[PDB]
Nucleic acid binder design. Structure first.
Length: 113
RNA sequence: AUUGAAAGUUGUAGUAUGCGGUCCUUGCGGCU
């Protein structure tokens, strides 16, 4: 499918390669927010919604796997972050507890995008 | 041929000491 990236000249070709899995990217929010694909869905109509972006991939499952594959590459750095976060908690003698999502969770659904 | 002649309001001196832009606030509702 035809995809266009309205960013600076040299970034546009790299963003193309990232979304096409021709080049590895290690930051999820970066590729999502600053390298938004504008997908030529039909005619001269370009779209930047997740519904249109999904067409860059074989299927919904392929799209999901890509996102999480990018996400997971921060694991090593995130572990140190989470450990310092726990150290932060205990320095303030915090009441620490863990809970699990019982259903789907979406915080910040309405952030302008 | 005068109450006249002569005489630097100058010298020294930190607008400074104390003081959290903070507190209260579910990016959500379902509409156009």
């Amino acid at each position: 499918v035809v995809v266009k990236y309205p960013v600076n000249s040299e970034l546009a070709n790299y963003a193309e390669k990232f979304w096409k899995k021709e080049l590895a990217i290690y930051n999820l929010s970066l590729i999502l927010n600053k390298m938004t694909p504008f997908v030529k869905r039909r005619s001269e109509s370009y779209k930047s919604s997740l519904s249109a972006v999904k067409e860059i991939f074989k299927n919904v499952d392929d799209f999901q796997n890509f996102l999480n594959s990018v996400l997971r590459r921060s694991l090593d750095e995130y572990r140190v972050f989470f450990e310092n976060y726990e150290r932060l908690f205990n320095s303030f003698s915090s009441k620490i507890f863990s809970m699990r999502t019982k259903s789907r969770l979406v915080v910040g659904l309405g952030d302008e995008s």
